[PDB]
């Protein structure tokens, strides 16, 4: 959602945004 | 060796809707797992489609969700909604609460009613969407001319109106200052093409209740803030 | 040689037709309607003289708004209306002199070669600060037909134009050049938009002003913040339609 | 790492006519549904090839898309243009209204006259064009040196009549302050051959409807903006 | 129409510009 | 997401030689169209080969494009030209004009001299290069003993001389405030061997021709503004 | 004559110089 | 610890960071 | 002496740097 960037992010997706994680 | 930049002439400018990221600054953060959750939803039109109540005007102005119907034929309708996602009649409901917040819409409306009234209650309703340019329906000659649907009653308690998309253009607004012809289309009245009929022992008056919502097709655009307003 | 003009349309001849001669032409492009077009020309301005932090209120100054209409043709405060709405003519500002500026907003450029009936495009906007001092300026864009939200601050000194999920710019500083730039989409609810003229009424009681269209702009931008404000459009993927005629020059 | 870079000594400056696009604010946008519209055109220079009306000078200085002819021959031109896309002659042609927008022009150029007399008046123009040098032909016997086509009148009601592009350059001026040889490309004179002929009954003037565009091979180039001037 | 640049935009398509769609 | 930049110390600084383009501003134009031209050059180099004239001084002081010979053999050269792009005897030549704009040279001279004297007479002259170190030669004696050529008229009406390169360093000044070993690299003086002979009916002086020009290995480089001065 | 970057031009080659054409 | 861009680093890794190295 | 830089120089090497030859 509003993510129209056509080059990848210069930040790691681990820095740029929270680490998603399931806890099973 | 460095590199040459042309510096456009909006150097520092926020742009609150750019559709890029800024720099992180808590990163390699987990985010508090929550796989146990339900009842997630990822689009807004999902809401648009539950149907909510319309505000129905009470002998003493006051609002409720239904309107009354007895055992007459009134002349004129019963109610009347025009078709506006600005209409005070379903300003309350969940399809006009998100719909304040985008531009435009398309695709059907579905008006559901359900007759509360007594079992033994009996009677026809003559539900009509009339396409504006010859203004409002008169009578039920001229409400019958436009798009209807005859509500009988019985052991199915609700009725599922479709207020079909019929415009000239492809979308259309929201709200609107003054009405135009991409912001208002038209009008919905529910007339009584039977008495309410009864036995002896049941209250003359039955109450209807009112909803409304998006059909299967329907859509909005263009996230937007509405205009504010202090709550009461 | 001979033809029939009555038949609507003649033969585009070159100088072999009648003599002894050759076809002389040379590629060219810079005639296409898209590329004619994709460029800034000024179209508007705007001016405010309420700080950032304060209550947006529409006022006019001489002619000048602090709030715009997105639209080539001519636009200004019509019949005392709160905001800016799409004219149907050109006035001189001055009573006297019978001479420009005039005191309707318009892409002068737009409005003396528009050789189309309608046309359809996005809207790159630049909005430029007529003096050196520092910027710091708040710009709310509001889609076609939107809510323009002339509301109250619901938080003290903060700029409430910039309380909104409206798309909106904020530059300030010593660090800044003085100058905003955006490209909107077409957002108007009619799929292209009159050029010049539109032949009805807006309203179902024909009660609007006979020639313009409902919801013909590219929406609105409201200003807050010191200063004067140049403003420019270019029309970015643009297309027209229906061929029709220019405005008339007096004969030389 | 961050990346050096060295900031050019523009930074800032607006160029209206870069070549490069800025930021989207509102993206993820659908351009309303077009698909139906018809008589889209994407090159100006299609206007520049639809004939349209020369302004010539009625007998009282008014302005008219034609000029009259009669039983006569007379021994100077019935009318005379200036082959520049500045003539004030065709000043509000379409070719003209587009080619102020522009900077150069290459190519022919068409004079369309159209016969609008009786369908029993007969005779013969002769249509010159001469280009400069030795200034503006002064008898049928100079304008004839050049080039010319006899225009016979008849079933066939018009004649298309090319101005050849003869110049110096490859390109030449759309306007000027003062004629150069770039800019104004000689005249272009039609002239009675033989009288107007008719029978009894019939008006002694002839009116031939005049108009300009651009030919098969006619280009313009550089966008430019035109001198202003107020409407009236 | 005054698209000289080499590299590709930074920006996506559907962002940088209007969604062209047929109705039909 | 938005790159880390790190602006280097010199940001906005305006380069008058840096090796790089900047915005277009009105591409996309034809640039008009010259397959027709003759005569273009690409190197300025051309330039300084083709032969120019030195300015010898008249008896009067006057600038003159030769120099006189007669009947005798002087003791002294009847001209001294110091090896230099700074002389003011080539100061008009072509290859000075050039060498102006430039800080170094390298590479072969040629120094053409046209004998345009009778048919009738004839003579030789003794064309010597002197390095420096030792000083002007003072003497025929001393002139002959560096690097020299024997030019004796006849037929072929002129002598095409070459001062080789001899440099203590591979590229040499093309300007001085004072002379150094870096930019004055000696004399090319002429002397007249045996005397100009002649009949009866004939002038006493006849006139040689001097011209100068790079030789075929001759090379120029780095751009540069000369001292500026005042046409007159 | 002047050309020393290695990275091709950001704009194009039609809009960052003028475009050559021989008349025949 | 704390690296988290996608691109490399502009400055060598020699220059950038300090040059371990085992004296055996 | 003193290189640190992982990608290439922007400018050519011809003109970032004085160009060496013998004259040999």
């Given amino acids: 959602g509003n993510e129209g960037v056509i080059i990848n992010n210069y930040y790691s997706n681990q820095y740029q945004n929270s680490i998603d994680l399931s806890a099973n | 060796s460095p590199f040459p930049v042309t510096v456009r002439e909006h150097a520092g400018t926020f742009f609150s809707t750019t559709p890029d990221t800024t720099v992180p600054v808590y990163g390699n953060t987990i985010s508090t797992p929550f796989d146990y959750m339900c009842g997630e939803f990822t689009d807004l039109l999902s809401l648009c489609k539950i149907p909510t109540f319309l505000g129905n005007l009470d002998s003493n102005k006051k609002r409720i969700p239904y309107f009354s119907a007895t055992n007459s034929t009134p002349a004129t309708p019963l109610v009347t909604y025009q078709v506006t996602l600005s209409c005070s009649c379903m300003a309350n409901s969940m399809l006009a609460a998100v719909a304040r917040n985008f531009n435009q819409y398309r695709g059907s409306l579905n008006y559901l009613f359900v007759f509360t009234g007594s079992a033994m209650t009996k009677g026809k309703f003559l539900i009509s969407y009339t396409p504006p340019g010859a203004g409002e329906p008169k009578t039920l000659d001229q409400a019958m001319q436009a798009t209807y649907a005859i509500w009988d009653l019985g052991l199915n308690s609700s009725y599922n109106f479709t207020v079909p998309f019929i415009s000239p253009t492809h979308y259309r607004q929201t709200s609107y200052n003054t009405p135009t012809i991409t912001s208002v289309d038209g009008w919905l009245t529910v007339w009584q093409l039977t008495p309410l009929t009864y036995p002896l022992g049941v209250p003359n008056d039955s109450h209807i209740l009112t909803l409304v919502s998006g059909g299967d097709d329907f859509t909005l655009r263009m996230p937007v803030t509405f205009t504010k307003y202090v709550p009461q | 040689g001979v033809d029939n003009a009555e038949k609507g349309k003649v033969s585009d001849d070159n100088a072999s037709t009648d003599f002894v001669a050759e076809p002389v032409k040379l590629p060219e492009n810079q005639t296409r309607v898209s590329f004619f077009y994709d460029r800034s020309t000024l179209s508007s301005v705007l001016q405010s003289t309420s700080d950032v932090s304060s209550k947006f209120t529409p006022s006019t100054a ?125 957002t108007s609810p009619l799929s292209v938009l009159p050029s010049v003229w539109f032949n009805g009424f807006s309203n179902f009681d024909n009660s609007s002003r006979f020639g313009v269209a409902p919801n013909a702009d590219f929406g609105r931008l409201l200003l807050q913040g010191q200063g004067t404000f140049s403003v420019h459009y270019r029309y970015k993927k643009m297309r027209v339609f229906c061929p029709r005629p220019t405005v008339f020059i007096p004969w030389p």
Same sequence: chains 1, 5, 7, 8, 9.
């Avoid at chain 3, 002199?97 to 409005?111: L, R």
């Avoid at chain 3, 359809?120 to 630049?126: A, G, P, Q, R, W």
């Fill in chain 3, 62 to 186: 001489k002619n000048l708004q602090n709030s715009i209409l997105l639209t080539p043709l001519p636009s200004d405060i019509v019949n005392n209306s709160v905001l800016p709405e799409q004219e149907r003519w050109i006035s001189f500002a001055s009573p006297t002199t019978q001479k420009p500026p005039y005191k309707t907003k318009q892409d002068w450029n737009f409005i003396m070669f528009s050789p189309f009936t309608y046309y359809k495009c996005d809207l790159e906007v630049t909005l430029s600060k007529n003096d050196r001092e520092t910027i710091s300026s708040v710009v709310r864009y509001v889609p076609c037909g939107a809510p323009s939200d002339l509301s109250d601050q619901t938080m003290p000194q903060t700029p409430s134009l910039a309380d909104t999920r409206d798309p909106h710019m904020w530059v300030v500083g010593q660090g800044t050049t003085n100058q905003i730039s955006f490209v909107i989409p077409y």
